[PDB]
Design a binder for this molecule. Structure first.
Ligand SMILES: Nc1nc2c(ncn2[C@@H]2O[C@H](COP(=O)(O)OP(=O)(O)O)[C@@H](O)[C@H]2O)c(=O)[nH]1
Length: 582
């Protein structure tokens, strides 16, 4: 265990760009010596954190980004930068996570390195550095030129069983020659001594270059780009050498922030010999060990067969075993130091997102079929004074329940309030519970659209009863009926949820999106930057947002993105109410 030799990476890519094939291929070359698979490359341990299938599911994505250190963005070189690529690309920036790119499918028809380099700076605002040059196109792609070391590689087949270093062929000797010089320029921007050498026509050393490019890559200023064909086993190991050469180690990135029990909010460093701070990010019920809980250790060591405190749930837990998932097998270990990750068997209360610390350690908390229908709520507007009355011969015996209540509207969000104002026993004390229950039962489904009635204040103040005919049932119905008429005669109004949205669209559609929203009864609050895109935010009724995704696309070329969360309830406009009633 060396902290510098760890590489926690994620593989982000638009659907079909080749995340699976790339990942699988990596496990194959890494192997011929799962939330978090592990493997080795040149004495480095690479932990491949699995990333969310659809980048749209925000919650998971930001968690993933948070647990991984570096990332590999995979592109389909016949398509260039795609929509999901942008989404996941803004996300990475949002979390300052170093990247490198892989131009996959260089064997496919239409595959072109330059389409990717261009689209990258065009759409994403990136400053790509060409690190390799292909040798051949589509069906003839067969080699790779390493522009930084001036080396060429040829693959004798699509099986990955033949690779030879060759001299840079003559037809590419000039092309490679200038990109090397361009490479040296970029490096010079991060290493003063390289510039001096550049100015006086002196070739810097690979170490200098690699170091410089690495520094740039980690600082989030450049983006090394590599290419190959996963499906045809071309470039895979060079891509692995890249992850070691440029992606960061737990040490190269900014410390994670923790909010303690007082809010002093302090940073926690990857010290193996310091308090134990860890986070569970994915739970999976394994069939051989039952319930696996994956975690990322930020600080201190976690040992097998020990106790840990789950600072989020207050609970306490026993760490039975510590497992490591490899390509084709499991491995059991006595520990997991800081900056490392693995599975933990034993936890019972810990769920996705919870923080775990050592027993005697700083209690810090690292984180905080039908058709889809809206959650409506009914309520009233003016105070009312009605009466419930159930009187009739049902079941041989008479029935008689009579209640008089005063219902009055309460401040939005005040809830419910019941008052017993009866006196002189006009209603037998034994029936009050019946009356109350009839009321809370009828509030479950309002008379306007059948949704829970809310923010009202009921007050039982009168009624009558029969010596023999009264009964609990009678007073339950009468209380029920009373409330129903209370809501009908109280100038009722439907309330609806108002979400606060967040739409990120390149300023090219600016006025288009902020125009469609208003068509959904929204209300623009403000705007701001976020790279090449603009972040629009407003209050849109949840009813108007159904299917917004397959709408924002056909109005942003799929380059649009949004997230929304409940904000408050508000009375629907008279027009909209009238409609709903139908
Ligand atoms: N020709 C070619 N096609 C590829 C390559 N990598 C992936 N594909 C194909 O792309 C499709 C999607 O692959 P996949 O790895 O599942 O991508 P994902 O959907 O991002 O996980 C499959 O049909 C692959 O066989 C490549 O380097 N060359």
């Amino acid at each position: 265990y060396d902290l510098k030799r760890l590489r926690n990476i994620g593989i982000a890519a638009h659907i079909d760009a080749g995340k699976t094939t790339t990942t699988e291929r990596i496990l194959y070359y890494t192997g011929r010596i799962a939330a978090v698979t592990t493997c080795f490359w040149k004495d480095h341990r690479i932990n491949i954190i699995d990333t969310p299938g659809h980048v749209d599911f925000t919650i998971e994505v930001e968690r993933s980004m948070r647990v991984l250190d570096g990332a590999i963005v995979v592109f389909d070189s016949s398509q260039g930068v795609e929509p999901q690529s942008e989404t996941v690309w803004r996300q990475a920036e949002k979390y300052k996570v170093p990247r490198i790119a892989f131009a996959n499918k260089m064997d496919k028809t239409g595959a072109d390195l330059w389409l990717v380099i261009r689209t990258m700076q065009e759409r994403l605002g990136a400053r790509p550095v060409v690190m390799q040059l292909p040798i051949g196109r589509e069906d003839t792609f067969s080699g790779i030129i390493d522009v930084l070391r001036m080396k060429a590689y040829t693959y004798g087949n699509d099986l990955g069983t033949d690779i030879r270093e060759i001299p840079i062929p003559e037809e590419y000797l000039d092309n490679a020659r200038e990109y090397h010089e361009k490479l040296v320029e970029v490096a010079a921007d991060f290493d003063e001594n390289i510039m001096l050498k550049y100015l006086e026509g002196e070739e810097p050393t690979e170490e200098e270059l690699v170091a410089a490019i690495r520094k740039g890559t980690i600082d989030l200023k450049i983006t090394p780009v590599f290419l190959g064909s996963a499906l045809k086993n071309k470039g895979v190991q060079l891509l692995l050498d890249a992850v070691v050469d440029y992606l960061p180690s737990p040490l190269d990135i900014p410390p994670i922030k923790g909010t303690t029990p007082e809010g002093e909010v302090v940073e926690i460093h990857p010290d193996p010999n310091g308090p134990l701070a860890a986070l569970a990010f994915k739970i999976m019920a394994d069939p051989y060990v039952g319930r696996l809980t994956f975690i990322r250790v930020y600080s201190g060591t976690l040992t097998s067969g020990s106790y840990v405190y789950n600072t989020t749930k207050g609970r306490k837990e026993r760490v039975a075993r510590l497992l490591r998932m490899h390509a084709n097998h499991r491995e059991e270990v006595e520990e997991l130091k800081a900056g490392d990750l693995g599975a933990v068997v034993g936890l019972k209360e810990t769920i996705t997102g919870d923080t775990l610390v050592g027993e005697d350690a700083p209690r810090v908390i690292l984180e905080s079929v039908g058709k889809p229908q809206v959650a409506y709520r009914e309520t009233i507007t003016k105070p009312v004074d009605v009466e419930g009355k159930f009187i009739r011969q049902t079941g041989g015996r008479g029935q008689y329940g009579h209640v008089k209540i005063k219902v009055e509207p309460l401040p939005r969000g005040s809830g419910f309030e019941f008052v017993n104002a009866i006196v002189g026993g006009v209603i037998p004390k034994e029936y009050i519970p019946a009356v109350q229950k009839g009321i809370e039962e009828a509030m479950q489904s309002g008379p306007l659209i059948g949704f829970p009635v809310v923010d009202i204040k009921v007050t039982l103040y009168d009624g009558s009863y029969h010596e023999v005919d009264s009964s609990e049932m009678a007073f339950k119905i009468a209380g029920s009926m009373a409330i129903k008429e209370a809501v009908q005669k109280g100038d009722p109004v439907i309330l609806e949820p108002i979400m606060r949205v967040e739409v990120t669209t390149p300023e090219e559609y600016m006025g288009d999106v902020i125009g469609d929203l208003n068509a959904r009864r929204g209300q623009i609050l403000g705007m701001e930057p976020r790279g090449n895109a603009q972040v629009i935010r407003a209050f849109v009724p949840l009813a108007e947002m159904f299917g917004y995704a397959t709408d924002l696309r056909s109005k942003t070329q799929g380059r649009g993105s949004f997230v929304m969360f409940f904000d408050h309830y508000q009375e629907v406009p008279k027009q909209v109410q009238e409609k709903l009633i139908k």
